[PDB]
Write a protein that binds this DNA or RNA. Structure first.
Ligand SMILES: [Mg+2]
Ligand SMILES: [Mg+2]
Ligand SMILES: [Mg+2]
Ligand SMILES: [Mg+2]
Ligand SMILES: [Mg+2]
Ligand SMILES: [Mg+2]
Ligand SMILES: [Mg+2]
Ligand SMILES: [Mg+2]
Ligand SMILES: [Mg+2]
Ligand SMILES: [Mg+2]
Ligand SMILES: [Mg+2]
Ligand SMILES: [Mg+2]
Ligand SMILES: [Mg+2]
Lengths: 129, 144, 150, 155, 81
RNA sequence: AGGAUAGUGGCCUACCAUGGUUUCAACGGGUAACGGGGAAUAAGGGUUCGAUUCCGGAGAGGGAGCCUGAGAAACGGCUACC
RNA sequence: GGUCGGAUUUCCAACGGGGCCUUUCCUUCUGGCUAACCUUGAGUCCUUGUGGCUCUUGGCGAACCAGGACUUUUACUUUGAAAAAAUUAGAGUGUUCAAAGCAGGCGUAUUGCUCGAAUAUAUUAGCAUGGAAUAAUAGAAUAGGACG
RNA sequence: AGGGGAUCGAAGAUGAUCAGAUACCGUCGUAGUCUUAACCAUAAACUAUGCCGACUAGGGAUCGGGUGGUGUUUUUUUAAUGACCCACUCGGCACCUUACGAGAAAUCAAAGUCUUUGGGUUCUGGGGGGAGUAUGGUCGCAAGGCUGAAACUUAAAGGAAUUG
């Protein structure tokens, strides 16, 4: 049974990106998924995306611009201190100059650069580069 | 996936699984069972003293043909009987019977070395004198 | 799915998107409520009440035309059963299988199916006890089951 | 409560050095000492207006609350004036950066000013040793429903 | 492929796809106003009835259940919606 | 409730109740176990060691008992048994 | 810009914050230091861009003291107090160098002046403390519900 | 243990073959094979591929159900039906091509979405032997099953593929 709709979302996006598709369908599209998409859209890894309002759970159609290398969840969502963010970025990111580890902090879902600017920490959600 | 639990609250399962599968290592099993203390000719020691019981000629393993000139000795501290190889050209005339020898391993923590079958120890000294010194003629074997 | 099978069929009903349907129904929601009540007094379970309503009348979704569900309406009108419908039918199936088994000793397939049915009964009864639909220490005893189902 | 032989013991149960002078008869005719436990906890009206003695009561006894304040759920109400609470917690295992469920059973004295059942949540304050295993007194019952009065049969 | 309008697909394509597998799932059944020669009453029936609905006047039989859509009687007229 | 203690406490006694712990591993067995500060190694995560210079505990051949004393169940104190 | 790629700025770029309004909780009195003043009977001269406006009568005071018309419960994360010394990392210092140690350095030596002996880390749990995304938990269904 | 007991056939007999044949081959034949009531609980019990969920590729078939037809067909030589055809669709046993991907390779539509390593979860392994042995426990009437070491020994054992 489904245990992480975010995991299914990012797997579907990753497979479409690998196969060269310019658009992907995501279901059931929670608001954690929506916040994750907004972060990667802010950084430019995806384009416009559309929430389909069916009366059950919703859907997302994401437009892909071929700039995404890999996106995926970190399950389980480990708690991270301030000083373990550097370790997580070293482990998960290809380089120190680009790519983002997505955190869910009490201040909200943000990327690790924004978290370090805000001096906040939370749980680890996923990555994108 | 991966056939192992991943949840944040599965630490007990992971730790217990690691503990259970740890028993398949050799060194961990020896340490936890205390095999060196219990079942080992030495009491976990590097060296041990013994009294030579007899001189033996051990045939070499294939593809080598030789007589390896070992000694059967009985350890002082526990009375166990072991076979020790006497390493050098000659040096079996230095050993004699009823003499006191000091023994070490070959270097393979058990595990008989080379073409000598079932021999895990070597003679370092006899009658309190180093076998190397007796072979190099630096010293002489005491009468006692 | 198919918690006690390998089947993976979907075979579901797809209710319409429009929660305010169907722009051609003219009967009053109150008249629907009396129809539901009179069927319950006739002795029909909520699922087959909704079936016959949707069939012989234009009422597509009772929860849409009326503001509440069938079981909620019956409970509000004092017609709720002592045990829920799905649990009642699982118990009835178990009684049927047990009656078959008492005479068919060598039906090991029936014994296997009986075990699966009883385990489904116990899981549903546990859910109902936690949600307080059933009283605590309510138990499927397999001795008073025939009494429970009549 | 008021009934069922408050003096059920072989000795007369009373608050020490609290004299109910028989020569002078006031309106209330009896004198009950009590105190506030402090730390924001309030003395219940049951303790204020009760008949029980309970020398171990945090409000009407001789014990005082000082030290740790703990919270837990009730798992046993089988012995007299003592309950067992369960303090569930998660223990961090750094090597796996994960957690494991652990629990402790704390025996705690419950004053008759409180009514507790299995499932209630109570805050307990540390006191001087009361028995072999008990070191805490119930100081507040954070129970609103209890999940007992909504499981009855429906008519 | 490799570039598609997933948001605005073809009506023929959705008519082809499964009822649960469209962009927004919905029923493909419908309701019929049914007239029997016996009287002037109009009976609302379900396409996939799964019962033998009966008319108030012609109170024996109107339709017969089948695997999918109900098999309306030969002596009967009907109208969609 | 009492006794005892410097004092709380089944610490002990009288009476009463039947409780208390446990697969979230009780209870039992093993340890070539004194605990810790710490040590060796070590990309990160870890692995192994810590009788031993500092802290805490325990013991003075093995047990038990006790005197004097603020402080000892002391042993370069006593008493008994082995 | 008399200031030889060398030390800029309320016309601001992007940030990290707090406060207020938008249907927006701070449940509520106790007495007053007269709410970041929604009152100008008076009145304060710096001779024409724009933040240095005096005695302000009260006047609807949450930026404040324990009495209860006072509290759903956590996980998580931030910050802070402590967490012996030695050891570890590390600042200074010509032990002749070094391991070390915590010493030393400078006057005309006429009867003396002076730098030090830093700093960091030391986990889990406990204690305070800001946050309320993520995860759990509870509520009003035979109303035994809320508000006065 | 009762019934049954045609056939075939551990044991056995017997004729061949053979150096020997208490093997293969031939002819018989007890137990078994069948059944009832009880035991046993093991197989290369195999897809040697745990289960649940999501996504990724190009086709032709076929089973079950359902939907639709400028379709046909034995009835009315122009009726439901049933049977075929075409287009779909859901579920299933599977196949064909190729791997973009994976793999040591054989190969694999999963054995893919893995150093760009985290969807959930159970079980098992840690060089070859000793050894599934010894012992303890537990089950069985027994045969035996389940659980299950150590001493010691040893430099390979093993997988896939290449050439001969
Ligand atoms: Mg199942
Ligand atoms: Mg007492
Ligand atoms: Mg007592
Ligand atoms: Mg010891
Ligand atoms: Mg130590
Ligand atoms: Mg001592
Ligand atoms: Mg003295
Ligand atoms: Mg001495
Ligand atoms: Mg001494
Ligand atoms: Mg097979
Ligand atoms: Mg197998
Ligand atoms: Mg099939
Ligand atoms: Mg092995």
């Amino acid at each position: 049974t489904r245990s992480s709709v975010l995991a299914d979302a990012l797997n579907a996006i990753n497979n479409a990106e690998k196969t060269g598709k310019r658009q992907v369908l995501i279901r059931p599209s929670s608001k954690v998924i929506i916040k994750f998409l907004q972060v990667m859209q802010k950084h430019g890894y995806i384009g416009e995306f559309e929430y389909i309002d069916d009366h059950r759970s919703g859907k997302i159609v994401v437009q892909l611009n071929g700039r995404l290398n890999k996106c995926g969840v970190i399950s389980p969502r480990f708690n991270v201190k301030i000083g373990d963010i550097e370790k997580w970025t070293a482990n998960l990111l290809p380089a120190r100059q680009f790519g983002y580890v997505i955190l869910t902090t009490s201040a909200g879902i943000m990327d690790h650069e924004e978290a370090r600017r805000k001096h906040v920490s939370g749980k680890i959600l996923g990555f994108v580069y | 996936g991966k056939g192992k639990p991943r949840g944040l609250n599965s630490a007990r399962k992971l730790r217990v699984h690691r503990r259970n599968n740890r028993w398949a290592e050799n060194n961990y099993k020896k340490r936890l069972l205390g095999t060196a203390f219990k079942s080992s000719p030495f009491g976990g020691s590097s060296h041990a003293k013994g009294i030579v019981l007899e001189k033996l000629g051990i045939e070499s393993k294939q593809p080598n043909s030789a007589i390896r000139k070992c000694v059967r000795v009985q350890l002082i501290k526990n009375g166990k009987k072991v076979t020790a190889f006497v390493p050098n050209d000659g040096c079996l005339n230095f050993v004699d019977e009823n003499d006191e020898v000091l023994l070490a391993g070959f270097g393979r923590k058990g595990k008989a070395k080379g073409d000598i079958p079932g021999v895990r120890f070597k003679v370092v000294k006899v009658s309190g004198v180093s076998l190397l010194a007796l072979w190099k003629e630096k010293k002489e074997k005491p009468r006692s | 799915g198919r918690m006690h099978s390998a089947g993976k069929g979907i075979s579901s009903s797809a209710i319409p998107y429009s929660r305010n349907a169907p722009a051609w129904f003219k009967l009053s929601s109150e008249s629907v409520i009396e129809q539901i009540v009179k069927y319950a007094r006739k002795g029909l379970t909520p699922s087959q009440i909704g079936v016959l309503l949707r069939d012989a009348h234009g009422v597509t979704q009772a929860r849409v035309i009326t503001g509440n569900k069938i079981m909620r309406i019956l409970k509000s009108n004092g017609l709720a059963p002592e045990i829920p419908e799905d649990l009642y039918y699982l118990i009835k199936k178990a009684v049927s299988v047990r009656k078959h088994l008492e005479r068919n000793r060598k039906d090991k397939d029936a014994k296997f199916r009986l075990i699966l049915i009883e385990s489904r009964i116990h899981r549903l009864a546990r859910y109902y006890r936690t949600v307080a639909v059933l009283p605590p220490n309510w138990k499927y005893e397999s001795a008073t089951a025939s009494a429970l189902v009549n | 409560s008021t009934e069922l032989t408050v003096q059920s013991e072989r000795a007369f149960q009373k608050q020490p050095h609290i004299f109910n002078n028989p020569k002078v008869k006031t309106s209330k005719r009896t004198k009950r000492w009590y105190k506030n436990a402090g730390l924001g906890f309030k003395t219940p009206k049951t303790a204020i207006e009760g008949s029980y003695i309970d020398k171990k009561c945090p409000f009407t006894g001789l014990v005082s609350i000082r030290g740790k304040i703990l919270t837990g759920t009730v798992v046993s109400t089988k012995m007299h004036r003592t309950i067992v609470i369960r303090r569930a917690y998660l223990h961090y295992i750094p090597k796996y950066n994960r957690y494991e469920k652990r629990h402790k059973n704390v025996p705690v004295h419950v004053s008759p000013a409180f009514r507790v059942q299995v499932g209630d949540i109570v805050t307990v304050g540390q006191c001087r040793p009361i028995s072999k295993t008990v070191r805490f007194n119930v100081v507040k019952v954070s129970a609103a429903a209890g999940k007992a009065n909504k499981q009855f049969a429906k008519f | 492929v490799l570039v598609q309008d997933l948001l605005h697909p073809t009506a023929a394509s959705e008519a082809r796809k499964h009822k649960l597998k469209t962009l927004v799932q919905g029923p493909r059944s419908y309701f019929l106003d049914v007239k029997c020669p016996g009287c002037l009453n109009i009976t609302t029936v379900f396409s996939h009835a799964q019962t033998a609905v009966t008319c108030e006047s012609c109170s024996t039989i109107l339709c017969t259940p089948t695997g999918g859509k109900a098999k309306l009687s030969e002596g009967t007229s009907f109208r969609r919606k």
